[PDB]
Design an enzyme around this catalytic site. Structure first.
Site, PDB file in Angstrom:
ATOM      1  N   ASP A  58       0.884  -1.190  -0.119  1.00 24.01           N
ATOM      2  CA  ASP A  58      -0.091   0.083  -0.014  1.00 24.01           C
ATOM      3  C   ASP A  58       0.955   1.320  -0.053  1.00 24.01           C
ATOM      4  OD1 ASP A  58      -2.652   1.188  -0.308  1.00 24.01           O
ATOM      5  OD2 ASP A  58      -2.966   0.972   1.842  1.00 24.01           O
ATOM      6  N   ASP A 101       0.997   3.121   7.724  1.00 23.86           N
ATOM      7  CA  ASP A 101      -0.171   2.268   7.437  1.00 23.86           C
ATOM      8  C   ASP A 101       0.413   1.101   7.282  1.00 23.86           C
ATOM      9  OD1 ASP A 101      -2.559   1.176   7.545  1.00 23.86           O
ATOM     10  OD2 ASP A 101      -3.364   2.688   6.013  1.00 23.86           O
TER      11      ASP A 101
END
Ligand SMILES: Cc1ncc(-c2cc3cc(-c4c(C)ccc(O)c4C)cnc3[nH]2)cn1
Ligand SMILES: Cc1ncc(-c2cc3cc(-c4c(C)ccc(O)c4C)cnc3[nH]2)cn1
Ligand SMILES: Cc1ncc(-c2cc3cc(-c4c(C)ccc(O)c4C)cnc3[nH]2)cn1
Ligand SMILES: Cc1ncc(-c2cc3cc(-c4c(C)ccc(O)c4C)cnc3[nH]2)cn1
Ligand SMILES: Cc1ncc(-c2cc3cc(-c4c(C)ccc(O)c4C)cnc3[nH]2)cn1
Ligand SMILES: Cc1ncc(-c2cc3cc(-c4c(C)ccc(O)c4C)cnc3[nH]2)cn1
Ligand SMILES: [Cl-]
Ligand SMILES: [Cl-]
Ligand SMILES: [Cl-]
EC number: 2.7.11.1
Lengths: 274, 284, 284, 274, 284, 274
Positions: free
Chosen positions: D153, D171
């Site tokens: 990601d 994240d």
């Protein structure tokens, strides 16, 4: 994470085992050699402990605990096995644990079940072998009954050979402590009347033995099934057997529990010493 | 003496047949049927291939080993009749002609079915024609669409409980574990088979979708000639929607593709029988 | 090449239109529609305002960004069509004209709707006429009564997934999370929105009532021009049926009074759409 | 009650914090200064520790754990973040805990995301700034890939400025340990073919960089989206960029993973040292 | 002033009767009914035997003690009306004529019923004719079959909430806890009675079957003239399907036999009202 | 297994108690002498501790915890009782625990409730007795209110006689700590307006006392019920009572909370000392 399961109230440690690695304690702590069984319950594996390099059998549950009735039922078996304790004619639990809701029982490695063994034999099964299994199992019974325990599932599937043939009693999932269901094939008849005791197991063993002695599958219903529980021996099932062995089985299959011999009582007979 | 067991009951519960004389000591089953073979034997008792002396037609009659061993035992045995009845007639569902008891012994008389898929596919190799599979797939899907439409869940869908019928049409049987959704309530399934179980059952709650997974696995098993994982890593992967290449290979992209829809771990995304039977590859 | 996606399927799955020539390298969507504007873009892909070259009518077409990324992805995408279809036509539910795929790209063609309530009410201040609200309330309640009557639960009721229709009639959309109760089973909702979630979902099980709460909050949010609590104390209070005065004030006792019925923490005491639509203030 | 959450296997204590008072550990142990984000996940707050008086960011989950899939998914992110460890180009977790099924992650306070920052800029974004972010993130990648980790990601939303601008990667909810889904916009094409590796992240970063360099939103579908994953640069997207920068991105966006440059390989180039 | 409370609502909500003049300061209830006796009093308020001045017929009117104490209180009170209405007319279910409020006071007017089974059987010894029981059994089973057919669960089945009707026909009442399965969702029942609760409720999920157990116990209690266990070992045994001889004795094998079917711990094996009402001993 | 339940944050031990035996801690650790109550909640037993041979009352829950709302609600009562602490006019919790999801509260053995006692009396109940109960309960109130606690369920059912008659306040399941429903019969009217304080309890006690003093059941609805909450004494309810007692009750039943006397204020009056 691995939690020792015991009703003698608990983390586990071993060589080969690193808590940080992904693989499970079972995966990390043993070599898997063969699969000894599989079915509803999960799988039984022949394992070498990386701890001691000794052989064992481990029983792995298939799915995580499905809920309390699944968990309770599964964990009952450990509670039971522990209450039995160490006996040379009773399968020995080294230890039990869970990891990811999976339950493992570590026992002494046993050879095949009597069912497997007697199947592999013909009907040429020496009556000698039988007597050995009979005495060996009565000892297992005698031990349990003296402690106030009824096994409730005494059959050739649930009886395994040890090294040197000595046969040991296993699968204590249905074992109950008097005070505190079993196979219809080997079921005692008092059970049909809501009444049970240690006698039950003696009847079941009477039939366990009749079956392997005769190398005849036991009736699955009909008149055949009733007769046995009204203490009737079919001549089809009593040929090739010593008047001695037959007479014993008669006393084990006495339909009246209150009249049925005890393990101790039976182990007192001349033919059943040594 | 012979009491009919039905929950669509009637004030005609005493049983009568050609070849049956009440004053004879033989049971109704002994008097009333010619036993031609034994099709099964286990814990439950026995299943026989029988000729009706009444109508001369061939049936399967399952006779229970012992009398009712207790209230649970009686309830468990009677629940199968109750379920089998709730199903109704469907060409892809094992038909029950009648059930009765005598001295505590439950008898279920059904249409005579061929062998289970387990047996049939065991008996084939991986030489199993993928064609036959689609048949079995479609035929069982129809059975489910029928059950699911009626708000029934089987909860024991597996090659053992699927028998071959008149010509090729495979029939869904052993309604022992079948439940009527809304009656019982979505709760822990105690006496289920974990080998075919849907993941959502481990979290207590379920729906019809449960059966679709089970059929997913049922078909996968016979399609592969592979025994399904009995635990460990292998077992969890199928319930997290991973198709271990050892199975997925050997099966047409077309067939491969469908089982995926059936094995979706999320009941909420998993296909319905209704929906699957809409796909062209499964029509007529 | 263009395969129709439907679970009410047909042996007419190849797609045809005015302006579409298969032998041209352009996609069906490129050939068959005039793109007039882009109404949305995110993770899912894109939504365009389009003129049908076939029937010249205006629609919304949602095109997925990538091809199917995998079995889960394919299932998730197809489940929306399956759901959208199970809903059927209702004047208060976004109509799907058709869905199709091409080289792994899912397209959903719906009636062209105006902007979401979120947008519409964002764009108003607290100058939002309380009158409009009742309209939205009633209009969405009707949608739910329609879904709930059919044993369907949406599980994603929020101003984002509610669009304005022909004249003023607001339409319920994004049936991505919709489930058929009894199919899946009342279990953990993974990909749900916690901002609008009913309390009973934290305990695993749910019913239609879930949507009524979500609509409770949906209406509360737009009625207040207040953003709803994104966690902490504030968030738990709404799911324990406390109305923090900061919201409840500014709203007619009449309106205030109803939302209470909708936000009852106990699903078992919470009003139904059927029942709420019976109240005079919500009729005609 | 507060339980430290760590996969380095656990009670918490602090000034300002009295176990007997009703307010939560988070409530009692920090001052809340701003809300840095909010959405599906919950909220991110600028906090001063009452322990040390130092700035941090805390991530609070919105609802209690909805069940095991919610709990597992939430807790994966901590496991991940820990496995990353301390790196100056990777967002640092001080500690995590739960209290009333709510999950809190305590990290170093980072400045805005690249997405926020580059948005706030025009297209007048100095190519200088870009190079810094590029090297800075490759370092983050180089560190992860060497440990056998793929982030999955890698995008401007998930990359934050540190004090002194040094950009750090965050994240790690979608981070996987090779062996043991991501944004379609920044998705590598091998992924569409069921195949992934460390290469994936390099492609994503290639696009992360192309986007901010061009101050052009990346295609959300259509031919635009495919082209990039067939290694085609639109001239619309390559104007105002140094032949140097462009050439690099070509090597990062090579459609064949097996042919796509490595972080280490890229950090070896003259333009990408200092 | 008197507002009708109904969820089958109408634009006729102002209330009128013979003997009622709005301009008089007395309440509608004071003006409109002759109070002949008080049939109950507790936390809820009061129940009176009353003559309608309108139609001169006898009814029961339950009047709530205080005004609505809050939103929960209002919801809880109104949910009973909503439930009572969802039931409909059945000869074995307490009929509601109408409900209304006035200055926050809820009134429920039902058919006038005799005393609860609890009272009636309390008042008998163990001299209770086993004949009467079967009547009560059948009569309540019919009520359940009616509720369960309509996808309703009562969740408060007990001798307290079962009243004697015109001649002998016993009526099921107090629909306070009744839920529509699929609306709420099978979740924790907070304000339930543990004395009659089915085991499956301890695991969160339930179905209609729940009521069958509760009726099992309801009948057991009155059949024995024994108070049911209020906890400890005794209490768990009934929910693990053990019949402690102290109860099971004194009851015909026939009656004994049925309660077993009703008290099966496994909802999935437990009989339905439909199914039980099929047995000969419970027909006509 | 037995777990001490206390919000002063835990295994239990005693004579008579063997962890390995099947019977529960409660079963093993006490003799059961009588059942003092039963209903929705479970049962209250008169018990002799096998530990000390002293009398207590134990409250057993009927079913295991039905879920979090059942568990939370049940456990609130302990939290409450603890926060009250030791007072001679407040029922004393020795200890609480759970075993198999069953909750037990061990308190001082109290005699009957005022409701029971006054019922057993006629209307010949000495006004003397009343005054004692009044002062005794005000003391209980005075203690709670000073700690920032409102009981919310102040009635003759929830007030028990101690040895030597001293009446003590019990059932703290509905007790709330100001900041952090009750019987409609004894409900204060401000409550109907969403407003509550310590005053509530004073009103309830005003009615608790009016009821037993008059040996008249309090109105269950109608005009009767409203009147009291508009500070109107029915002459039906004020006969046979001293102008003294009556005047006091007027001050306790003042409809305006902001105008209603305090426990301390009332305990300051000549008639209410000694
Ligand atoms: C050919 C062949 N087949 C099967 C075996 C075999 C099965 C088996 C099961 C246990 C066991 C376990 C593992 C757990 C609990 C428990 O009661 C028991 C009895 C132990 N040893 C075993 N050996 C050997 N040889
Ligand atoms: C080689 C071989 N093996 C097995 C069969 C066979 C087993 C069988 C069982 C039933 C049945 C019965 C009898 C009762 C209840 C019930 O659900 C069912 C499905 C019906 N038909 C059957 N055919 C045929 N051929
Ligand atoms: C300013 C503004 N913003 C957004 C819109 C708008 C978005 C939108 C999405 C769909 C749709 C599609 C396309 C597929 C599946 C599905 O559930 C839905 C609801 C239909 N109509 C729409 N109108 C209009 N105006
Ligand atoms: C204008 C503006 N807006 C947003 C920020 C900002 C967001 C943010 C998120 C984390 C974080 C947290 C808290 C947990 C886990 C995790 O992976 C990360 C990356 C840390 N620091 C942050 N700063 C700064 N400035
Ligand atoms: C000795 C004696 N005791 C009690 C009665 C009696 C109580 C009673 C309650 C209702 C009622 C009401 C009024 C409202 C809602 C509701 O569910 C119900 C069941 C109806 N009829 C009744 N009869 C008769 N005789
Ligand atoms: C005739 C007769 N009947 C009943 C009693 C009696 C009931 C009673 C309840 C508690 C108690 C318990 C046990 C737990 C929590 C709690 O708040 C309380 C008040 C203590 N002592 C009691 N004695 C005495 N005499
Ligand atoms: Cl089977
Ligand atoms: Cl959306
Ligand atoms: Cl009641």
């Amino acid at each position: 994470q691995p939690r020792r399961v015991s009703f003698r109230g608990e983390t586990l440690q071993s060589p080969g085992y690193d808590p940080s690695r992904p693989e499970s304690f079972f995966q990390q702590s043993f070599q898997r050699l063969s699969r000894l069984g599989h079915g509803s319950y999960g799988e039984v594996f022949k394992v070498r402990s990386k701890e001691d390099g000794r052989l064992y059998a481990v029983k792995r549950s298939m799915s995580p605990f499905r809920g309390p009735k699944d968990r309770a039922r599964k964990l009952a078996e450990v509670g039971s096995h522990e209450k039995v304790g160490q006996h040379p004619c009773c399968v020995r639990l080294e230890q039990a644990w869970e990891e990811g809701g999976i339950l493992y029982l570590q026992t002494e490695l046993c050879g095949p079940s009597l069912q497997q063994h007697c199947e592999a034999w013909g009907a040429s099964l020496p009556e000698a072998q039988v007597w050995g299994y009979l005495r060996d199992t009565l000892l297992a019974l005698a031990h349990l009954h003296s402690q106030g325990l009824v096994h409730l599932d005494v059959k050739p599937a649930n009886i395994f050979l040890g090294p040197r043939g000595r046969c040991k009693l296993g699968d204590f999932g249905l074992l109950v402590e008097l005070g505190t269901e079993g196979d219809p094939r080997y079921m005692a008849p008092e059970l049909l009347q809501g009444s049970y005791g240690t006698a039950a197991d003696v009847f079941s063993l009477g039939l366990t033995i009749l079956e392997v002695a005769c190398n005849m599958e036991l009736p699955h219903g009909g008149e055949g099934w009733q007769q046995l529980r009204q203490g009737y021996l079919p001549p089809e099932f009593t040929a090739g057997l010593s008047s001695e062995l037959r007479s014993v089985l008669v006393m084990m299959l006495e339909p009246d529990p209150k009249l049925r011999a005890t393990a101790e009582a039976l182990l007192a007979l001349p033919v059943l010493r040594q």
